[PDB]
Swiss-Prot record:
<feature type="disulfide bond">
    <location>
        <begin position="4"/>
        <end position="31"/>
    </location>
</feature>
<feature type="disulfide bond">
    <location>
        <begin position="10"/>
        <end position="30"/>
    </location>
</feature>
<feature type="disulfide bond">
    <location>
        <begin position="6"/>
        <end position="20"/>
    </location>
</feature>
<comment type="function">
    <text>Host-defense peptide that contributes to intestinal innate immunity and mediates homeostasis at mucosal surfaces by forming higher-order oligomers that capture bacteria and prevent microbial invasion of the epithelium. After binding to bacterial surface proteins, undergoes ordered self-assembly to form fibril-like nanonets that surround and entangle bacteria and thereby prevent bacterial invasion across the epithelial barrier.</text>
</comment>
<comment type="subunit">
    <text>Homodimer. Self-assembles into higher-order oligomers termed nanonets, fibril-like structures that entrap microbes. Self-assembly into nanonets seems to protect against proteolytic digestion in duodenal fluid. Interacts with Y.enterocolitica invasin and S.typhimurium fliC/flagellin; the interaction creates an anchoring site for progressive DEFA6 self-assembly into nanonets.</text>
</comment>
<protein>
    <recommendedName>
        <fullName>Defensin-6</fullName>
    </recommendedName>
</protein>
<comment type="similarity">
    <text>Belongs to the alpha-defensin family.</text>
</comment>
């Protein structure tokens, strides 16, 4: 499986896969 998190900045081990809107705020959708 793959796991993704909405983050303001992806970790170095994660791939930035599009935008996630959190509480109205633009975040990255960070997957690994
Ligand atoms: Cl897995
Ligand atoms: Cl799986």
């Amino acid at each position: 499986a793959f796991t993704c998190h909405c983050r303001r900045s992806c970790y170095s081990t994660e791939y930035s896969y599009g935008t996630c809107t959190v509480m109205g705020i633009n975040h990255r959708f960070c997957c690994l």
